[PDB]
Design an enzyme around this catalytic site. Sequence first.
Site, PDB file in Angstrom:
ATOM      1  N   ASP A  50       0.756  -1.258   0.000  1.00 51.31           N
ATOM      2  CA  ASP A  50       0.000   0.000   0.000  1.00 51.31           C
ATOM      3  C   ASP A  50       0.786   1.308   0.000  1.00 51.31           C
ATOM      4  OD1 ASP A  50      -2.250  -1.906   1.921  1.00 51.31           O
ATOM      5  OD2 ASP A  50      -2.730  -1.048  -0.066  1.00 51.31           O
ATOM      6  N   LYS A 107      12.439   0.943 -12.283  1.00 52.15           N
ATOM      7  CA  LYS A 107      13.742   0.399 -11.926  1.00 52.15           C
ATOM      8  C   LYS A 107      14.825   0.807 -12.909  1.00 52.15           C
ATOM      9  CE  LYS A 107      14.249  -2.210  -8.998  1.00 52.15           C
ATOM     10  NZ  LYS A 107      14.569  -2.050  -7.553  1.00 52.15           N
ATOM     11  N   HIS A 142      15.329   8.490   9.061  1.00 53.70           N
ATOM     12  CA  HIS A 142      15.905   7.532   9.967  1.00 53.70           C
ATOM     13  C   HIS A 142      15.579   6.078   9.685  1.00 53.70           C
ATOM     14  CE1 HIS A 142      17.352   6.008  13.891  1.00 53.70           C
ATOM     15  NE2 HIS A 142      16.268   5.255  13.843  1.00 53.70           N
ATOM     16  N   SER A 195      18.737   0.409   7.107  1.00 52.16           N
ATOM     17  CA  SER A 195      18.414  -0.892   7.672  1.00 52.16           C
ATOM     18  C   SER A 195      16.952  -1.239   7.446  1.00 52.16           C
ATOM     19  CB  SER A 195      18.699  -0.870   9.164  1.00 52.16           C
ATOM     20  OG  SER A 195      18.146   0.293   9.732  1.00 52.16           O
ATOM     21  N   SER A 217      10.487  17.825  10.051  1.00 57.21           N
ATOM     22  CA  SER A 217      10.763  16.494  10.556  1.00 57.21           C
ATOM     23  C   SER A 217       9.693  16.194  11.608  1.00 57.21           C
ATOM     24  CB  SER A 217      12.154  16.474  11.159  1.00 57.21           C
ATOM     25  OG  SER A 217      12.364  17.665  11.888  1.00 57.21           O
TER      26      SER A 217
HETATM   27  N1  LIG Z   1      23.480   1.649   9.931  1.00 61.63           N
HETATM   28  C1  LIG Z   1      24.263   0.921  10.790  1.00 61.63           C
HETATM   29  N2  LIG Z   1      24.589   1.454  11.973  1.00 61.63           N
HETATM   30  C2  LIG Z   1      25.360   0.795  12.866  1.00 61.63           C
HETATM   31  C3  LIG Z   1      25.841  -0.523  12.531  1.00 61.63           C
HETATM   32  N3  LIG Z   1      26.576  -0.948  13.586  1.00 61.63           N
HETATM   33  C4  LIG Z   1      26.587  -0.013  14.526  1.00 61.63           C
HETATM   34  N4  LIG Z   1      25.851   1.103  14.149  1.00 61.63           N
HETATM   35  C5  LIG Z   1      25.619   2.400  14.999  1.00 61.63           C
HETATM   36  O1  LIG Z   1      24.337   3.033  14.726  1.00 61.63           O
HETATM   37  C6  LIG Z   1      24.352   4.138  15.656  1.00 61.63           C
HETATM   38  C7  LIG Z   1      23.053   4.975  15.695  1.00 61.63           C
HETATM   39  O2  LIG Z   1      22.092   3.920  15.785  1.00 61.63           O
HETATM   40  P1  LIG Z   1      20.522   4.288  15.835  1.00 61.63           P
HETATM   41  O3  LIG Z   1      20.169   5.166  14.698  1.00 61.63           O
HETATM   42  O4  LIG Z   1      20.054   4.944  17.237  1.00 61.63           O
HETATM   43  O5  LIG Z   1      19.974   2.774  15.696  1.00 61.63           O
HETATM   44  P2  LIG Z   1      18.413   2.271  15.616  1.00 61.63           P
HETATM   45  O6  LIG Z   1      17.620   2.809  14.481  1.00 61.63           O
HETATM   46  O7  LIG Z   1      17.592   2.449  17.007  1.00 61.63           O
HETATM   47  O8  LIG Z   1      18.862   0.709  15.381  1.00 61.63           O
HETATM   48  P3  LIG Z   1      17.735  -0.354  15.132  1.00 61.63           P
HETATM   49  O9  LIG Z   1      16.687  -0.399  16.372  1.00 61.63           O
HETATM   50  O10 LIG Z   1      18.476  -1.772  14.980  1.00 61.63           O
HETATM   51  O11 LIG Z   1      17.048  -0.043  13.852  1.00 61.63           O
HETATM   52  C8  LIG Z   1      25.657   4.890  15.348  1.00 61.63           C
HETATM   53  O12 LIG Z   1      26.145   5.665  16.445  1.00 61.63           O
HETATM   54  C9  LIG Z   1      26.589   3.676  14.858  1.00 61.63           C
HETATM   55  O13 LIG Z   1      27.804   3.594  15.640  1.00 61.63           O
HETATM   56  C10 LIG Z   1      25.470  -1.078  11.240  1.00 61.63           C
HETATM   57  O14 LIG Z   1      25.835  -2.179  10.893  1.00 61.63           O
HETATM   58  N5  LIG Z   1      24.688  -0.329  10.410  1.00 61.63           N
END
Ligand SMILES: Nc1nc2c(ncn2[C@@H]2O[C@H](COP(=O)(O)OP(=O)(O)OP(=O)(O)O)[C@@H](O)[C@H]2O)c(=O)[nH]1
Lengths: 495, 495, 495
Positions: free
Chosen positions: C116, C123, C206, C210, C390
């Site tokens: 949705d 692509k 944000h 991931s 934001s």
């Molecule tokens: N994108 C990413 N960040 C990482 C990884 N490993 C460690 N980090 C750390 O990600 C930190 C910030 O994380 P947040 O944005 O608060 O993480 P989050 O969104 O709550 O993480 P999730 O709950 O797993 O989605 C930075 O200070 C990095 O040091 C990785 O593999 N990928």
Amino acid sequence: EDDPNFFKMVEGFFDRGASIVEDKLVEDLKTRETEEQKRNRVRGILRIIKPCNHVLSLSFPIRRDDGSWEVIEGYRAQHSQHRTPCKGGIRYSTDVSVDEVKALASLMTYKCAVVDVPFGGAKAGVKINPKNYTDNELEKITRRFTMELAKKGFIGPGVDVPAPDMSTGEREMSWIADTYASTIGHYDINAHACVTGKPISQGGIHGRISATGRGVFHGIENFINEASYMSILGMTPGFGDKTFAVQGFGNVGLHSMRYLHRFGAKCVAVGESDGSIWNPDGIDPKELEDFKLQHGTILGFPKAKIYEGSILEVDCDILIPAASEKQLTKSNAPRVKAKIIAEGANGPTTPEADKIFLERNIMVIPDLYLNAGGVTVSYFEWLKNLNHVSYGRLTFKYERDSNYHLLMSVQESLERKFGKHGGTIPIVPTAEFQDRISGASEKDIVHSGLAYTMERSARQIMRTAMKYNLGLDLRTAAYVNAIEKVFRVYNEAGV
Amino acid sequence: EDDPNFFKMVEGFFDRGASIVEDKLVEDLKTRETEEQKRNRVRGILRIIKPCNHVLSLSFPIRRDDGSWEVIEGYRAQHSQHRTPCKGGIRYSTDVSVDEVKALASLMTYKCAVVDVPFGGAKAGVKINPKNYTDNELEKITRRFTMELAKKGFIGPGVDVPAPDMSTGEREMSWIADTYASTIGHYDINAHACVTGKPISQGGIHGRISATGRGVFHGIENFINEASYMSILGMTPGFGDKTFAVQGFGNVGLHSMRYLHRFGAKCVAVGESDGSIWNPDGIDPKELEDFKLQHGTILGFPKAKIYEGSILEVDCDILIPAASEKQLTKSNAPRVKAKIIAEGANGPTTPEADKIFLERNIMVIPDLYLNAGGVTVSYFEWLKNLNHVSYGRLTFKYERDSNYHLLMSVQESLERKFGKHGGTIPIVPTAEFQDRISGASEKDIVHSGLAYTMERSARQIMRTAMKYNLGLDLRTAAYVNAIEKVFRVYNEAGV
Amino acid sequence: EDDPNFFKMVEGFFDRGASIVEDKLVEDLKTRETEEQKRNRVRGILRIIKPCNHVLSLSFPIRRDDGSWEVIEGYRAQHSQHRTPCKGGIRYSTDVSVDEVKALASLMTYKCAVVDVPFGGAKAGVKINPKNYTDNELEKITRRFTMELAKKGFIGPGVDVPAPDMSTGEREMSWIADTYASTIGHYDINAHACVTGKPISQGGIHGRISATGRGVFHGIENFINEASYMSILGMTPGFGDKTFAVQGFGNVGLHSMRYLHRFGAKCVAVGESDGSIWNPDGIDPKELEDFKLQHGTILGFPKAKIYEGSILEVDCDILIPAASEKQLTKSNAPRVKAKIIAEGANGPTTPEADKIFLERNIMVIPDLYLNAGGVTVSYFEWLKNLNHVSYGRLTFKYERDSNYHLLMSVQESLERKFGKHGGTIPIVPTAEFQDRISGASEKDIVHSGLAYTMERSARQIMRTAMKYNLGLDLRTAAYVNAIEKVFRVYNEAGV
Ligand SMILES: Nc1nc2c(ncn2[C@@H]2O[C@H](COP(=O)(O)OP(=O)(O)OP(=O)(O)O)[C@@H](O)[C@H]2O)c(=O)[nH]1
Ligand SMILES: NC(=O)C1=CN([C@@H]2O[C@H](COP(=O)(O)OP(=O)(O)OC[C@H]3O[C@@H](n4cnc5c(N)ncnc54)[C@H](OP(=O)(O)O)[C@@H]3O)[C@@H](O)[C@H]2O)C=CC1
Ligand SMILES: NC(=O)C1=CN([C@@H]2O[C@H](COP(=O)(O)OP(=O)(O)OC[C@H]3O[C@@H](n4cnc5c(N)ncnc54)[C@H](OP(=O)(O)O)[C@@H]3O)[C@@H](O)[C@H]2O)C=CC1
Ligand SMILES: NC(=O)C1=CN([C@@H]2O[C@H](COP(=O)(O)OP(=O)(O)OC[C@H]3O[C@@H](n4cnc5c(N)ncnc54)[C@H](OP(=O)(O)O)[C@@H]3O)[C@@H](O)[C@H]2O)C=CC1
Ligand SMILES: Nc1nc2c(ncn2[C@@H]2O[C@H](COP(=O)(O)OP(=O)(O)OP(=O)(O)O)[C@@H](O)[C@H]2O)c(=O)[nH]1
Ligand SMILES: Nc1nc2c(ncn2[C@@H]2O[C@H](COP(=O)(O)OP(=O)(O)OP(=O)(O)O)[C@@H](O)[C@H]2O)c(=O)[nH]1
Ligand SMILES: Oc1c(Cl)cc(Cl)c(Cl)c1Cc1c(O)c(Cl)cc(Cl)c1Cl
Ligand SMILES: Oc1c(Cl)cc(Cl)c(Cl)c1Cc1c(O)c(Cl)cc(Cl)c1Cl
Ligand SMILES: Oc1c(Cl)cc(Cl)c(Cl)c1Cc1c(O)c(Cl)cc(Cl)c1Cl
């Protein structure tokens, strides 16, 4: 004596702050050639930030009421565009030169970085003394000025969004919007978002006029209640026992006085171009304003004497410069009396006055933070224009109902557990929650949004002043954040 | 000593010429309030002409070959728009400042008025020394510069059309066109008409490179063959017995030397920034050029000595300044030897040098006429681009046939009247008419169009110098026409 | 073998699902000619959906660092436009062909229909191996690629919005946005909404990086906790006792592993192009990632052996394909060991592998649902860009105050009813409601919005798999919804 190139004057503040952080900007960087070529690349990006990107210089004709031909000059500078659109007001004065406009423009961008408003800096100036033009002539000028700006990409909803500054109010903004939305933006769904500080009937937002004053208030409030900073000044926290004096009884001046007075601060002096007035027992914002409206000047105000001598030197706790730039110079700097300098206007004090004030141990709340309440609110107006809905309309009734049921959910639940034994347990709102029962209104967002921003940015600066022991050099602390933010962009985007 | 501010220097020439005609401009005027408010309205319109309308100031980053970051400055000014689009070249130098660009821009418009090219004046400058940049870096610069100009309406087929100037050739024009037609003008049917002085393969026109030289030649030719003017100088008409010296062996310099030499004039001196060379017996344009290409300098040329001393003072008949501005100042003015000053460059002599030259009785053919051959040809290129057909293509065969029949019509008619008694009376073309049998070609139009224009404008000036007894003050005569023309447009245009 | 045409392969899934619903689509239809011409008109609409509408093929030159000329090929396909704009990433690989791009494009649209997100599918692909180009050459490529797309209407805020895919990260997105907003979109107020997956400083949101992994997690979570489906697999619900293996340690791979591990799942295998690694006791996401960053490969990782043999065949509970397409074919299909196949990549398994997995009774969570978390979050980024605020800014303070008063309303009410007898009845927030006291922040909306979407779409599919006894053929169930939704739109439209 002590007259520095405003543009370079601001560059001075930038370089000073640039150094302080240069190290951090290199450490965070995680590139391959980790060698200090990293340090050059950071300095390279910084050399790129400092200068304006586009500066338009205008010269166009208008027809004076007496039938004659006069050429008027105007400028609009776009400092940065790491954030789109550009933002910054229009000043109507005979002191406008490119150098001034280029400076104010750059202050706008760092100003926004401190306060987190997604706009690059910009600023305009039309070399005229409004006091010598009829209303009819002014309108012709501001309208034609909007056109020549439009034609070259120096005004537009997503390009460059003007606002008020010296000698320009919502009346000017109102004509600007009208000219744009009636011509270039006839098909633009966001046409009225081409400028801020408009009359509310024109799409303005609640409290944009008093915005800066309200902002100045919060700026001071955040600092005059720290002790950490108040001790160093030999001052008790709180406004209740403070006296202030303000230079300029205008948009930023009048309202600054209004809010401080509202919180038990006492206005002992008010100034203008013709002169200053005084009263140790305090001057009232409302009667002074009506006198000023009726008589067109503050001089002559009954409940106050015509103070002879510099308004910047009068005896008080806080000095509020709300006039033009470089008012506090190396000369008069040592004779200020006030412990706190709340920079209301843009760059009211020279680099040397700073120096002296630092030594003299007089706290100077930097302009690029203290007066950021204007854009914060302008930004809210801009968002309002894009949204095409006044805050609360779609949800006023739903929240109200929803809230009474939330409250009714605890009531019916408690009556269920405590049965007939407790009888009815009425759960009604307090007077405060009643005023909120429907949710936030346009007025509510501006007021709290501004507050959230002024407060949040204050902490960001304090936090920085500590990490680098700048103590009372808040200006440098402020620029560190601006640079630190503006840089993170240019870096992360291939410049 | 004596090197005034360039912009006002040109304003000086304008005001001087403004006065001379002010009277006429009021007489021709036929308005209702015939009283001398007419005289104010004319002065009003003149106060409007003098200043530039739009001036864009750029500051943008480029990446040096060695990987570092450098900020480069550039400007583009649009003086007038009483004629659309604006026209004027791009100068690459470290001496470019807004004041210079604003000046050259204004010279472009009056230049066009003299020569009758329907363009308002404009001019650009990028503060760099090309000699310190690799070809790769230059291209990045000129391309990115085209973009920042485009984005703000400072380049476009019907807005502002650039061309070459100092340190910019068809190579730069070629990149400019390419960037524009590949981005902003991808859909514009006239995209390649966004700039002139392009390589012929890029839509350039024949002889635009040597255009200015050829023009300078015609300029002089028209005056060195008057007697009316030659007598006052104690000089015999004709090039055959003249010796000249030229400052600057560049686009305007080299070709100027080329054409004069072609018509029995003798080049006794050639100069540059490193130095000057000399030879009383004369220097040849072709061998000097090859030496210069092979060795990158004129110093060392075998068939000539390395003259020590000012090239502007050498003994000769005609002095050709083809370098930068204000070369002939109040200082050296009295020591020039030459009787004729053919201003090849823009504003090579200060207002006072004029004054001295007037008194010293040395004729100065003004830049805004003498070097107008460049835009005249640029204008032809622009027209070529719009037409999308090279001159002659559609008609070469038709005219040829048509012409043989025209000639055959007199033949068959005469054979009819003079019967067998005269036998055949063949009517064949002469060698000259044979070369024209098909009609004008692209090469033909440029050459004669330029000539028609240089000559026609010469007469327009002479005719004026007489009506106002300016005698040898041709510069003032030239400005009178420019003003006189630029005026009419504004008068009856709604100012 | 088993290397079908990726486009028809997907068409295969579409036709299969088309049939299943064809009947319903005819019943709901209420037209005049109720006769089964209705059934042809439905089939007509379906014949219209299946093919791409526009497919742009690019071939343009770039200048290699070593000074040479190389032609690079690229494609961008727009499958459907029943929803504007189109959405879909850019893959940088030597395996990109129009057929592939046309396929991935079509998967994007149905992908969006399941989840949705109001975007039609699109692509892109640039036929290069990034591993053989310097950072400088890549940037030139991605920038120039953005231009050639722009010029033809194949990128724009309301037309086609790209995002990352294979070998393209936020670095590429960052250059794309920059090129667009600096040229074509200089006046667009929504310029930065021309692409998603941008750096946060560039207007990214944000957790978009991931995003897909987090999504894959929710996808599995929704199914590995049903019993209805877990029984049929002879598996206990929950992640706590599962071991998985994933092919591809990239954006979708790494994070998939990260989240599963976070919830007590054990990664026993990780693969790449060079090879696979293994460890029955489990591999950790953080140390593997750091090894991979430091050494540029997973091969050699100390806490694991270099598994010889297909990563797609290793013994585990769940197999996660996060590499390219058609990895699971008819050949290796029977030798998979895993009970669950969570299609991370787009079309990682051929139509026949499906068939086998159905029989083998191995559940395959379809790509067009399981990996939809990426666009769901990209869509949030896009909305963010349009909003220019934001999430939370305008309301953080208002809600916080409003909430404390809500809580204070029950407190003061209870203290009123239970008088001094109950003393004060303090009503404070729990640790959880404290973390929400101000309302949702950007992070909060992405996380719960994604979850709401993954869960809600899972039910929509399950609900369908039941109504048509597809049992473990979830792919067909998924397509039924996609078609059922898209059809309705082409229906009511005027086509
Ligand atoms: N994108 C990413 N960040 C990482 C990884 N490993 C460690 N980090 C750390 O990600 C930190 C910030 O994380 P947040 O944005 O608060 O993480 P989050 O969104 O709550 O993480 P999730 O709950 O797993 O989605 C930075 O200070 C990095 O040091 C990785 O593999 N990928
Ligand atoms: N919305 C806004 O206008 C905002 C403005 N600012 C800042 O505040 C300043 C603008 O004030 P606005 O322009 O807002 O003020 P407004 O023009 O109303 O201020 C009017 C007052 O300024 C006085 N004044 C002008 N020059 C001097 C001087 N040299 N000394 C003493 N008094 C003087 C005037 O006296 P007189 O009439 O005789 O000149 C008049 O009473 C700017 O520099 C800007 O940086 C920041 C944010 C918002
Ligand atoms: N299409 C055109 O280019 C047109 C040009 N013009 C006029 O001619 C001038 C342009 O010349 P272009 O730009 O054509 O010339 P080009 O750069 O070829 O001129 C090159 C010559 O100028 C010499 N030179 C530069 N500075 C000085 C100096 N301070 N003193 C003495 N010699 C110097 C150079 O020496 P070196 O190489 O060592 O620097 C070189 O020999 C302009 O002012 C313009 O008004 C007019 C109409 C059209
Ligand atoms: N927003 C997004 O990015 C989304 C991505 N997806 C899906 O995931 C796929 C994208 O993965 P991304 O492109 O995210 O992955 P990234 O390129 O990081 O994946 C890198 C990993 O893929 C491995 N790999 C590539 N080809 C092969 C192969 N033939 N055999 C084994 N391993 C291989 C690489 O090994 P090596 O480095 O040695 O080549 C590397 O470890 C897409 O097809 C897409 O449908 C799903 C939803 C959204
Ligand atoms: N120009 C100007 N307007 C004022 C002043 N004081 C109040 N206003 C009014 O602001 C009004 C609406 O205020 P809303 O409540 O009604 O005002 P507010 O937000 O409570 O004002 P503040 O308490 O200062 O923030 C307008 O109708 C103005 O007349 C003043 O000193 N100058
Ligand atoms: N720099 C330079 N260019 C020349 C010279 N003579 C001709 N050209 C060229 O003009 C060329 C084609 O010229 P032609 O059609 O033969 O020139 P033309 O009409 O006989 O030249 P004039 O005789 O009009 O200069 C271009 O490719 C220029 O390089 C010269 O002496 N010096
Ligand atoms: O598309 C516009 C609009 Cl509607 C207004 C302005 Cl002021 C500009 Cl600059 C553009 C873009 C544009 C044009 O629309 C045209 Cl016809 C030419 C150019 Cl030289 C450019 Cl740059
Ligand atoms: O289309 C625009 C817009 Cl709307 C704004 C700006 Cl500043 C510019 Cl420079 C352009 C010119 C332009 C472009 O920049 C591209 Cl790449 C393609 C096209 Cl057909 C067009 Cl007409
Ligand atoms: O602006 C045009 C023009 Cl003058 C021609 C065509 Cl055939 C089209 Cl379809 C458009 C629409 C358009 C635009 O309006 C812009 Cl600003 C950029 C692009 Cl690439 C496109 Cl294709």
